[PDB]
Every structure is written in structure tokens, then in C-alpha cells.
Design a protein around this ligand. Structure first.
Ligand SMILES: Cc1cc2c(cc1C)N(C[C@H](O)[C@H](O)[C@H](O)COP(=O)(O)OP(=O)(O)OC[C@H]1O[C@@H](n3cnc4c(N)ncnc43)[C@H](O)[C@@H]1O)c1[nH]c(=O)[nH]c(=O)c1N2
Ligand SMILES: NC(=O)c1ccc[n+]([C@@H]2O[C@H](COP(=O)([O-])OP(=O)(O)OC[C@H]3O[C@@H](n4cnc5c(N)ncnc54)[C@H](O)[C@@H]3O)[C@@H](O)[C@H]2O)c1
Ligand SMILES: O=C(O)[C@@H]1CCC=N1
Ligand code: PRO
Ligand SMILES: [Mg+2]
Length: 1210
């Protein structure tokens, strides 16, 4: 039985001094990086003057010599230009040239273009919008574009369509690519090869999602090498053409986590392509991609350069990105490698293409700093400093200076001096964009320096997958190509020397002022939790030791009563991935000691309530600091006790830290002397987020002034015990927080105890219903229901239309459905695929499924761990077999035999016919797939809502009309657009749903603390200027009936309601996170008096709800002659169970009436109802007898605004 963590993440090879220096610079502060770059990039005054002169001459040439022309000729608006190009694109998808021309002449030009063209004409409008306008919009206003296309055709007819088609054909066949196939691209290269250029061809493959895709990219590269080599005809690697490849195209799991697979499976494929390039003697360049693939790619480069089968050939090339903080250390490593191997490595120096994405990734991951510079001028200095390094080593490497910036060019041209020969170094540029500049460089009559054109090769479909990334660059306010076209920009500004500008700044190397470090994402509110970089070798080495150490500890969990540990029954705690791995020991709580603990908490409550809220929050902040410091050890316990992967365990500890700091800040913002605690609160938590959810409930209750009885899930008591220990170390007194391990019997004894003033439950809907029933028996000393927060299961869907990008969808589906083996309340359960793209996406999804590694989670390479118990396994596998027994297609990955020592379920895809085939939440790694026709979208949303759950929901579409439609009709608490659906970042995506998924309020949001005090505070930003209009009509009706006091109360409720609140929450770049208050639905009213009914109706209507009024009240005569607007919202119910589901209830009566009604409500089928009760006299005395916070519904929506391939705002 293998030792825990003994193979966690061993590096591919022992790290040399040169490799360790690369790693040390990964996230070095920007003020530390620049000074040595400024020193390295310094040149003489004479050189600087000469370079400015050269740059000035180049830039004057460029300024003194397409779509814009079309737009001008026909006076097109921007939307008209974009729609015309979308139309042209579609028409070109028609292959038969004369067939197309006829469709245009006889059908399109005579209007009704909708009539003739299961896929929006405008799916790529974001890209064409960049071409026409220079600005990137994440989503497509398809109704605007359809109106514009109708308008321009009705105005200008076939001629404008003809010009649109020809324009599109030219840009897509000749400007964005050198050719559609390698043979065509080579034909078109002859002309500029004559003029002294050379070429490197890029076959536009990247991001293989399946083994099939990788093998297809491999054979594309192989066939291109043959065509290029045959065309090269012996010209060699400097004069003749080469090829560029992306390693991500050649393997579907190209990542540090899968390093062993990369070296075993990807390396041989690159070697075979390199052997072919060697035979023809052409270049083969490895392109640079994301920052977390840099160091892994060095391991491939090293093996290849030391492989004797490749000796005698100097065509191997490697890209280095000067916007990266590691660039100079990467170059030292490469130059040394070229010395040891004897290979003259071709080094392409670029600035870097993924800047937007790197900023967002570091912010999302809570890392210490960015792996790239944040000021564009720093990249320019880095570039020039690294060019100086390369030019001093031309004996050993072949520098290739890829840039379109004339200032950069001129600086390097003069840096290189007067001695030149072909083969010493070259410049490089991108096809289409750089020929203007470099035609001022190449040739004996210019600067007589060679330039290699990077030449994309691909069909229209292929080009558009990543044409945005390639444009977005030349289009930002900071880009040279953009600035030289701006007339407001002078030549003097363009020939400005970045080295000298940086040197003379006050602070050399300061971070950009408008980009937040990950720790500062929330500004003064609170400190963001910090993560761990699992691509950093130093981090992996350190984490390996801490994880090993955490596994030698003798973890225990005991009943920790206010007076001290209690004895009880003791059993071991086993690793769910391997029951031979004993993780610890738990002593469970007796039912008598459970009851004892509640009495002890009651007696302690005044002492804890009297601790000022700000000192209570200081305890939470201290606890957050201790967990941050203990994160590596906590990680190791979560991995082995709960079966979680390291990545998921990091995110869990972050969430615990975030809960603690968020509820501390909310407390400091809100709580004062009049917000009295409820009293002892019982917190019952689930196994599957055994630290974060556990901590959030307890931290909220404590900071609100309540002593807590913490009852963790029976499966995961050890991490709960550690969280309690940390909370007590931080200053929470033993009497304020008692730990009671055990099963549901401990939970139920706690709920039933008379001094229990409130319950916070997270778990299954079934168990929540049992707790609701127990509590219907009970009232508070004041005669009011015991507050219950119950956050329960989900049946979460994602809808995907034909505009979505399949590779993005598959990544988000694999993550959402099979991360944590699907053991997240938010996990994706039903994937809904538009019929037109269903087969393609499903094929890709099954391919990606078979790349997942299932096993014990103490290895970094494991993607999917075990399920928590053999009972959970049996329940999940029974579901799979029923489905398989109804004829449903079932796809499963094969499990390795090593899984036999634990409880594993293989990730599973099930193809359903209708959504009605699923009855209950299946809490496991099981994805169901259904298909829909686009016209039935609205019915599909109904089917999703019809399950009665309402937790998470995803939508993948580029089309605004679809977004508006679906998000206005779906009923769920957490929405996600063009991303995964498992985001629950505290204070950013406040988490929690409706219906069968919860009562609210949401955890990690601003209404949560108010449920745990007797008088609710006003949350930050909690108000609305909007007044419900049916409420206003009802207040007027009351005035007409003579109920003047109730009329005024109604108008007051109208004003106090926060319905219509609509906020954007601060978060990472490249995302919009929105928070809104909606109506809950239909509220059950159980009045006793006429005035009580009017107050209840006012509260419900003020918050946007409809109502069902208890007919047994006998108060029908009190609502004669209602305005139709109000009557539409009102119904009367004899049989409550028949008229649901309800979303809440308002009750009037004395204590025995409230208790009776409460039992009746708890017996209603379906969701748990948040009930509010008041006596007639309380309604008279207290205008907040019915609190409006609990009559609205919170909705969180997280939109990935980077999904179109770039970040506009950045
Ligand atoms: C032949 C060839 C081959 C390649 C590439 C280019 C060329 C010409 N690229 C793309 C390259 O990284 C770069 O994005 C473009 O060439 C534009 O940079 P220029 O120097 O031409 O212009 P320019 O001087 O305008 O520099 C713009 C660049 O500055 C950087 N930048 C912008 N804002 C910034 C900020 N706030 N802070 C820091 N830096 C900022 C970015 O790197 C951006 O591309 C690349 N890229 C890649 O990553 N891998 C590869 O393999 C290649 N391959
Ligand atoms: N909505 C959310 O925020 C959220 C988050 C995590 C998990 N969940 C849900 O939790 C479920 C999985 O967790 P679980 O298996 O640990 O849940 P569960 O319902 O099995 O058990 C949850 C807790 O209730 C206790 N319990 C069991 N019976 C009880 C009873 N009769 N009286 C009082 N307490 C009792 C258990 O000891 C445990 O602490 C899933 O349905 C999941 O969707 C929801
Ligand atoms: O594909 C890209 O964006 C960059 C430019 C050429 C190679 N890599
Ligand atoms: O992916 C694309 O379309 C761009 C075009 C040049 C290289 N990459
Ligand atoms: Mg259970």
C-alpha cells in the first residue's frame, strides 16, 4: 500500500541551477524585474540618436503608403458593415460559385434573407466587429445585426452584397491566411521570397481536446513538413521555409499536472516531426503559449536537443516571450543548452500573445503576482534587454526578432552593429500585417536585413477560431500597429525610447495603477485569500513535504463541550480512495451530551453576545490568518479524508478563508447593539465541502453573537475538528463553539433541544425536510418559528446553442460535471445540446472523458477522485444501471484495478430522451445529455424549471437575444454565461438557490447575517428606487375603501422593499458578476384579521410576489372590487397542497395558531417554505412584523466576458 504523497508531483528531471533561476523569477515583483533589464538594454547616446533616426524614416515610409472603403462607398453604419460581412461569410460557406451567385441574385437580394440562411448568420460577429470597428464585444446583438442587414439590402440590393462577398473572400483567403492549404500558401510565397523574404508556416492547430484531435493535428503537421521540405528543395534553414507548431495541438493533456504523459506520449510525436524536418533540412519552431506551459516545454526542448538521432540539424527553434518575467533566465538556459548540445537553437523573441488571459488567471487563482509585466513599456524594455543578450551569443544561437514595432526594430538593428551575414540573425513578421514595414527593411537598397513571414494556413472555419487573439493585439490603444494609424499620435511619440522613459520614472517598474494584484481584488473591504501555483516547481517541492508531514499526524475529532472533551464511541476514519490508509480517529457524541451541550451554550450566550461585534469579527479575521498559514497541512487532510484533488482542496481552504473575512467585514459594516442574537444555533454541515461550508455557517452564527453547536458530517469529522481548533486558537471561547461529531442522530438531538434558537443546515433536501418537520413542533419563547436556513440539492442544467464554441463547452462541461467526482451541489447534471451541434459536441465530450485520470488523489496527476462511501457508490451505480436498463446509451471510462481498495465510480455520460427521465439529484460523476430543436428552447427552459430545483444553471451562447430570453425565464439562484457552473466565490457569486434547492438567504452574500439576529440590520448597498406597481394599485384601493392607515403602511412597504436592486460585485477582470433581487413567487398568506390580511398583502406585493390566501380565514369579503392588476396577483386557496408550490408564507395569529399553521405548512409537498409569523398585536405595533428581506429572491449571475477570445476593457 503506497505511502501517502510519496509520488505527489516529482519533477521531470532534477532542476539545474539555471532551471531553478527560471522558477525563482516566475512571479517576482515588477519593481525587482526592471532595473537589470534597464541596465542590459542601455545603449550609447550615439546609438540612440541613430536608432531614432532610423525609426523615424521607417515610420514616415509606413504613413506615406479595405473594409473601410466598402463602408464609405455605401455609407454603412458599423452594424451594417458587420452584418454584411457575416452575410458574406455565410454565402462563401456555399461551395458552388454559380450556385451562390444565383441565390444572391434571385433570393437574397429580393429581401427575405432569413428565409434562406439552424445557425445564426452572426455567430462570428464579434470577430467581424473587430475588423469593422476595432472594438471587441463579447456577445453579439443579433437582433440589431438582423435589422441592419435587412436595412442595407433593402437600400442597396445585389451590388452591396457582391462587394461584401468579394471583400470577405479576399480577407479570408488572402489576408488572414497565406492560403487555405499548404500547397496554395507555398504557391503564394514565391513572390516575396524573390524579394528576399522567407516563410514559416503555421497550420493553425491548437488546444487538442481529444486523442483524435491530436492525431489529426499531427498528420496535418507531417503533411505540411513534406510539402514545405519538397518546396524548400535544399535551400536550408536560413534561406528556406520552415514550420511552426504548438505543443498543445499534439496532446490533449499538455500540462504540468500530466507531465509524465507529456514526456511519454507527446515527446515522441515531436521527435518524429523533427526527424522529418531534419531530413528536408527545414526549420521547426515550437511556439510559446500560456505561462504555465513555459517550463514544461523546456523539458521537451532539452530532451530533443540532446537526442543523437537529431544531430547534424540546426533547424530546431523555440519561442521566448519578453512580456514574461522569466524571459532572461529562460534565455540563459537555452543559450547554455545550445552550448552543451552543440545545436544552434533558433530563438524567436516575441513580446507575447496571451496577456489578457494571464492577468485574469492570476487574479482567479489568488497568486502572489503576475507572470507577465503589467505596463506595456516594461515588455518593450524586456524585449530590448533580451535582444542584447541574444546578440552577444550569435555564435551559439540564431536570434529571430519577431516584431512590428519600428522603434524596437531600429533599436536592435543598431545594437547588432555593422557586421552582418545571412545566418547571423533575422527579423520576423506576421503575414498581412508586417510586409509594409519590412519592405522598408529587406533588400540591398533598404537596410539589407532578412525577414521571415509567419504564414497562417487554414480554411475559413480554422482561421476564425483564434483570429481575435491575433487582431486584439493590433487594436489596443497601446499597440504600435494601432498607434501608427492614429493621427493624434506623432512620430516623436512613436520613436520614444522606452528604456529611457522607464529609467526616469519615480518608481522604476511600478505595477500598472489600474490592475489589481490578486490579493487586492476587493480593495479596502477585505484581503483576498491566496492560492498556490501547482505549476511552480518550488511550490510543488514544498507542498510535497508538507503533505507527507500532514499524513504522519494522528488527527482526531472529539466531542468538545464547553467543559472539556467528552468520552464516547471511537472509530477510525478511512481514506475513501484507499481504505488501508487510516487518516485518523473520531469519538462520536452521545445524545445525552448533545443535549448537555445546548444547555451549556444557552448558559454561555450572554457572555458571548456581550463581546462587541468588532471583537467578534477580529476573531474571524485571526482565524482566517491561521488557516492561510496552515493551508498546506489542511490541504493534505482534505485530500485524504474527503477524497479531493489538490486543486479542489486549495479552492476549499480559500473559500473558508473568504467566508471568515467576508462575514467579519459584513459584521463591521452592519451590526450594532440593537441587533440581538437569536441564541444557541445548531450548524449541521455536509461531507463534501467539509471545511468551507462548515466554517461559513459557524463563522456567520458566531459573529452575529450566537453560541454555536457544530455538528459536522459523519464522514469528515477530522477537518471539522481542526477548523474548530483554529477558531478557538483565534479567540472564540470554548463555550461559544462546541464540536459534536456524530451521525444524524446527533444532528436531530441538537435540533430538538428546547434552547436551540436557530438551525443552519446544508445537506440533502430529504434530510432538510425531516428537520423542517421537527421544527414545526417548536416555537421560540416569544411565540415565533425557529429560524431555519436550509441549503439543499440541485438538478443543474447547461444549455448550449449552435453559436457556442465546442472546445470551450467541453472544457466547462468536463469541469462542471466530473470535478470532485460530481460531488458538488452545483455540479452539472443535465447538458442540453441544440440538435444541429449535438453529435459533434458529444463526440468531443466522450473523447475528453477518456483523457481523465481516476484514482487516489494524493497524486497531482489525478483528475477525479473517489466517491465518499460505498453507500454513495451503490446508490450512484444503481441509477446508472436503471438508465442502462431502459436502453439509454451509457459511456464510462475504465477504472484501473488500483481503485479496488477504495470507493470509485467512473465518470459517466448518459444520453436521455427527455428531462422527465430524471427524478432526483444523483450526487456523483454522472452527466445526462439531452438534445433540443432551437424552436423548442422556451419549452426546454420550462422543463428545467419543472424539476422544482433551482441552484445553478449555465448558458453557452454568443447571441444576446438568446441570453435575454433564457436568463429571463430560468428560475435559479446562480447563473453562469460562457463559463463553468461551479463558481461560488464568496462575495462575488453569493451562492444558493430556490425551490427544492434552498430557503435562502445565500451564503457568502449580504443578507446572510441578518437571518441570525432578532432584528435585521440594513445590508450594505441594500435598497431600490423601484416601487412595485401592483403594490401602488393596492395602496390606492385601500385608500378608496377607507383603510387609510393600511394604505400608508402599503406605501411604506413599497419604499422599503429592495425589489429591483441590481448590483455589480467587484471581482476579477474578464468577468462581470451581478447580484439582483427578484420576487420569490407565490406567497401563502394565512391571515386572521382584515388588517392583518392587508399588511400581509402589502408586504408580498411590495416585493413583487403573487399570493394564495387561506380561504378558511373567512376574509373574502375584505377584498371586494380589487383592481384587475391586483386581482391578477391574488387567488384564494381551500387546499394549500394543491395550489403550490409556494415560495414563502406569512401567518397571523396567537402562538397556538402559529404552531398549528406551521405544522400544516411543513406538511405541504415540495420545497421548504420560509415562514414568517406575527400576532395581530405585533402587526399593529411593528411595521416590520413581516420582514421584506425574506420576501425577495437573490440571483447571482457570472458572465465570462473574455469568452470571445479577448478582454475589451484591458
Ligand atoms: C513571427 C511572429 C511569431 C509570433 C508572434 C509574433 C510574430 C511577429 N507572437 C505574437 C507577439 O507575441 C506579439 O503579440 C505581436 O507580435 C505584437 O507585438 P509587436 O512587438 O509587434 O507590437 P507592440 O510593440 O505594439 O507590442 C504589443 C505587445 O505588448 C505587450 N503588452 C500590451 N499591453 C501590455 C501591458 N499592459 N503590460 C505588458 N505587456 C503588454 C503584449 O505582448 C502585446 O502583444 C507570438 N506570441 C506568443 O505568445 N507566442 C508565439 O509563439 C508567438 N509567435
Ligand atoms: N445548496 C448548497 O449550498 C449545498 C452545498 C453542499 C452540499 N449540498 C447538498 O448536500 C448533499 C450532500 O451532503 P451530505 O450527503 O453530507 O448530506 P446529508 O443530507 O446526507 O447529510 C447532511 C448533514 O445532516 C446530518 N443529518 C442526517 N440526517 C439527519 C437528521 N435526521 N437530522 C438532523 N441532521 C441529520 C448529517 O449528519 C450531516 O451532517 C447533497 O444533496 C448536496 O447537494 C448543498
Ligand atoms: O498564435 C498566436 O497568437 C501567436 C502568433 C504566432 C504564433 N503564436
Ligand atoms: O489563429 C489565428 O487566426 C492567428 C492568425 C495569425 C496566427 N494566429
Ligand atoms: Mg448522508
Amino acid at each position: 500500500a503506497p505511502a501517502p504523497f510519496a509520488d505527489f508531483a516529482p519533477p521531470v528531471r532534477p532542476q539545474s541551477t539555471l532551471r531553478r533561476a527560471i522558477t525563482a523569477a516566475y512571479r517576482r515583483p515588477e519593481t525587482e524585474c526592471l532595473p537589470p533589464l534597464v541596465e542590459a538594454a542601455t545603449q550609447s547616446k550615439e546609438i540612440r540618436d541613430a536608432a531614432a533616426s532610423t525609426a523615424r524614416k521607417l515610420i514616415e515610409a509606413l504613413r506615406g503608403k479595405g473594409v473601410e472603403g466598402l463602408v464609405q462607398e455605401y455609407s454603412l453604419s458599423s452594424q451594417e458593415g458587420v452584418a454584411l460581412m457575416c452575410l458574406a461569410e455565410a454565402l462563401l460557406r456555399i461551395p458552388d460559385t454559380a450556385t451562390r451567385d444565383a441565390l444572391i441574385r434571385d433570393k437574397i437580394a429580393d429581401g427575405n434573407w432569413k428565409s434562406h440562411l439552424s445557425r445564426s448568420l452572426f455567430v462570428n460577429a464579434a470577430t467581424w466587429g473587430l475588423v469593422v470597428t476595432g472594438k471587441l464585444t463579447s456577445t453579439v446583438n443579433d437582433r440589431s445585426l438582423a435589422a441592419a442587414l435587412t436595412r442595407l439590402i433593402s437600400r442597396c440590393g445585389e451590388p452591396v452584397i457582391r462587394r461584401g462577398v468579394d471583400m470577405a473572400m479576399r480577407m479570408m483567403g488572402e489576408q488572414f491566411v497565406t492560403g487555405e492549404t499548404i500547397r496554395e500558401a507555398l504557391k503564394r510565397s514565391k513572390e516575396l521570397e524573390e524579394k528576399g523574404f522567407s516563410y514559416s508556416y503555421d497550420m493553425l492547430g491548437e488546444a487538442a481536446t481529444t486523442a483524435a484531435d491530436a492525431e489529426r493535428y499531427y498528420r496535418d503537421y507531417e503533411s505540411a513538413i513534406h510539402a514545405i521540405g519538397k518546396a524548400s528543395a535544399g535551400r536550408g534553414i536560413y534561406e528556406g521555409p520552415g514550420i511552426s507548431i504548438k505543443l498543445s495541438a499534439l496532446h490533449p493533456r499538455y500540462s504540468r499536472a500530466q507531465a509524465a504523459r507529456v514526456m511519454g506520449e507527446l515527446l515522441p510525436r515531436v521527435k518524429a516531426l523533427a526527424l522529418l524536418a531534419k531530413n528536408y533540412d527545414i526549420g521547426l519552431n515550437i511556439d510559446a503559449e500560456e505561462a504555465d506551459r513555459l517550463e514544461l516545454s523546456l523539458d521537451l526542448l532539452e530532451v530533443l536537443c540532446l537526442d543523437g538521432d537529431l544531430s547534424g540539424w540546426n533547424g530546431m527553434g523555440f519561442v521566448v516571450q519578453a512580456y514574461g518575467k522569466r524571459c532572461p533566465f529562460v534565455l540563459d538556459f537555452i543559450i547554455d543548452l545550445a552550448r552543451r548540445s552543440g545545436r544552434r537553437i533558433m530563438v524567436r523573441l516575441v513580446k507575447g500573445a496571451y496577456w489578457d488571459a494571464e492577468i485574469k488567471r492570476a487574479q482567479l487563482d489568488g497568486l502572489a503576482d503576475f507572470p507577465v509585466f503589467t505596463r506595456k513599456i516594461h515588455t518593450d524594455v524586456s524585449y530590448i534587454a533580451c535582444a542584447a543578450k541574444l546578440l552577444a551569443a550569435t555564435d551559439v544561437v540564431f536570434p529571430q526578432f519577431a516584431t512590428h514595432n519600428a522603434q524596437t526594430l531600429a533599436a536592435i538593428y543598431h545594437m547588432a552593429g555593422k557586421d552582418f551575414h545571412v545566418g547571423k540573425y533575422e527579423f520576423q513578421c506576421l503575414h498581412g500585417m508586417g510586409e509594409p514595414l519590412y519592405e522598408e527593411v529587406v533588400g540591398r537598397g533598404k537596410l539589407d536585413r532578412p525577414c521571415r513571414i509567419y504564414a497562417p494556413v487554414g480554411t475559413h472555419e480554422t482561421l476564425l477560431a483564434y483570429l481575435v487573439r491575433r487582431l486584439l493585439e493590433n487594436g489596443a490603444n497601446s499597440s504600435f500597429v494601432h498607434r501608427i494609424n492614429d493621427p493624434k499620435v506623432s512620430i516623436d511619440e512613436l520613436i520614444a525610447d522606452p528604456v529611457e522613459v522607464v529609467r526616469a520614472m519615480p518608481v522604476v517598474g511600478a505595477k500598472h495603477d489600474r490592475i489589481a494584484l490578486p490579493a487586492e481584488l476587493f480593495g479596502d473591504a477585505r484581503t483576498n485569500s491566496a492560492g498556490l501555483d501547482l505549476s511552480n516547481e518550488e511550490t510543488l517541492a514544498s507542498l510535497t513535504e508538507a503533505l507527507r508531514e500532514s499524513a504522519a499526524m494522528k488527527w482526531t475529532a472529539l466531542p468538545q463541550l464547553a467543559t472539556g472533551p467528552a468520552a464516547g464511541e471511537t472509530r477510525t476514519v478511512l481514506n475513501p480512495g484507499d481504505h488501508r490508509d487510516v487518516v485518523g480517529s473520531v469519538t462520536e457524541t452521545s445524545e445525552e451530551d448533545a443535549r448537555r451541550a445546548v444547555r451549556l451554550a444557552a448558559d454561555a450566550a450572554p457572555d458571548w453576545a456581550a463581546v462587541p461585534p468588532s471583537e467578534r469579527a477580529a476573531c474571524l479575521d485571526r482565524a482566517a490568518e491561521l488557516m492561510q498559514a496552515r493551508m498546506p497541512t489542511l490541504l493534505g487532510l482534505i485530500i485524504r479524508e474527503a477524497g479531493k484533488s489538490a486543486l479542489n482542496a486549495i479552492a476549499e481552504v480559500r473559500e473558508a478563508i473568504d467566508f471568515l473575512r467576508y462575514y467579519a467585514e459584513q459584521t463591521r459594516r452592519t451590526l450594532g447593539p440593537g441587533h440581538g442574537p437569536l441564541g444557541p444555533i445548531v450548524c449541521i454541515s455536509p461531507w463534501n465541502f467539509p471545511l468551507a461550508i462548515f466554517t461559513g455557517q459557524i463563522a456567520a452564527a458566531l459573529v452575529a453573537g450566537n453560541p454555536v453547536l457544530a455538528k459536522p458530517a459523519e464522514e469528515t469529522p477530522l477537518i471539522a475538528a481542526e477548523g474548530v481548533r483554529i477558531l478557538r486558537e483565534a479567540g472564540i471561547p470554548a463555550s461559544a463553539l462546541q464540536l459534536l461529531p456524530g451521525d444524524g442522530r446527533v444532528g436531530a438531538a441538537l435540533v430538538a433541544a428546547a434552547e436551540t434558537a436557530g438551525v443552519m443546515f446544508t445537506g440533502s433536501t430529504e434530510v432538510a425536510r425531516l428537520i423542517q418537520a421537527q421544527l414545526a413542533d417548536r416555537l421560540s419563547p416569544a411565540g415565533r418559528p425557529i429560524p431555519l436556513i436550509a441549503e439543499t440539492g440541485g438538478q443543474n442544467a447547461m444549455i448550449v446553442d449552435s453559436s457556442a464554441l465546442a472546445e470551450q463547452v467541453v472544457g466547462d462541461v468536463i469541469t462542471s460535471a466530473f470535478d470532485s467526482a460530481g460531488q458538488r451541489s452545483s455540479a452539472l447534471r443535465v447538458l442540453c445540446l441544440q440538435e444541429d451541434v449535438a453529435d459533434r459536441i458529444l463526440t468531443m465530450l466522450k473523447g475528453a472523458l477518456h483523457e481523465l485520470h481516476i484514482g487516489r488523489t494524493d497524486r497531482l496527476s489525478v483528475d477525479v477522485g473517489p466517491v465518499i462511501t460505498s453507500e454513495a457508490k451503490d446508490n450512484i451505480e444503481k441509477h446508472i444501471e436503471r438508465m442502462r436498463g431502459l436502453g439509454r446509451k451509457v459511456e464510462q471510462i475504465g477504472l484501473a484495478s488500483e481503485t479496488g481498495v477504495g470507493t470509485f465510480v467512473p465518470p459517466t455520460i448518459i444520453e436521455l430522451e427527455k428531462l422527465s427521465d430524471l427524478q432526483r439529484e444523483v450526487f456523483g460523476p454522472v452527466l445526462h445529455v439531452i438534445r433540443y430543436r432551437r424552436d423548442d428552447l422556451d419549452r426546454l427552459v420550462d422543463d428545467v424549471n419543472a424539476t422544482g430545483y433551482g441552484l445553478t444553471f449555465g448558458l453557452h451562447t454568443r447571441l444576446d437575444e438568446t441570453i435575454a430570453h433564457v436568463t429571463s425565464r430560468i428560475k435559479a439562484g446562480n447563473l453562469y454565461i460562457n463559463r463553468n457552473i461551479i463558481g461560488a466565490v464568496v462575495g462575488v457569486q453569493p451562492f444558493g438557490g430556490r425551490g427544492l434547492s434552498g430557503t435562502g438567504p445565500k451564503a457568502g452574500g449580504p443578507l446572510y447575517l441578518g437571518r441570525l439576529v432578532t432584528t435585521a440590520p440594513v445590508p450594505p448597498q441594500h435598497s431600490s428606487v423601484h416601487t412595485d406597481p401592483v403594490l401602488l394599485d393596492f395602496a390606492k384601493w385601500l385608500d378608496g375603501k377607507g383603510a387609510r392607515a393600511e394604505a400608508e403602511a402599503a406605501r411604506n412597504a413599497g419604499s422599503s422593499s429592495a425589489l429591483g436592486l441590481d448590483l455589480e460585485l467587484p471581482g476579477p477582470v474578464g468577468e462581470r458578476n451581478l447580484y439582483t433581487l427578484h420576487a420569490r413567487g407565490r406567497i401563502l398568506l394565512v391571515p386572521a384579521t382584515e388588517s392583518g390580511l392587508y399588511h400581509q398583502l402589502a408586504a408580498a406585493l411590495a416585493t413583487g410576489n403573487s399570493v394564495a390566501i387561506d380561504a378558511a380565514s373567512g376574509l373574502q369579503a375584505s377584498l371586494k372590487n380589487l383592481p384587475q392588476t391586483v386581482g391578477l396577483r391574488v387567488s384564494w386557496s381551500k387546499d394549500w397542497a394543491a395550489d403550490g408550490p409556494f415560495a414563502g408564507a406569512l401567518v397571523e395569529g396567537d402562538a397556538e395558531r402559529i404552531r398549528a399553521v406551521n405544522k400544516a405548512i411543513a406538511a405541504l409537498p415540495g420545497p421548504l417554505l420560509l415562514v414568517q409569523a406575527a400576532s395581530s398585536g405585533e402587526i399593529a405595533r411593528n411595521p416590520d412584523a413581516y420582514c421584506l428581506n425574506w420576501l425577495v429572491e437573490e440571483v447571482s449571475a457570472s458572465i465570462n466576458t473574455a469568452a470571445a477570445g479577448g478582454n475589451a476593457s484591458l
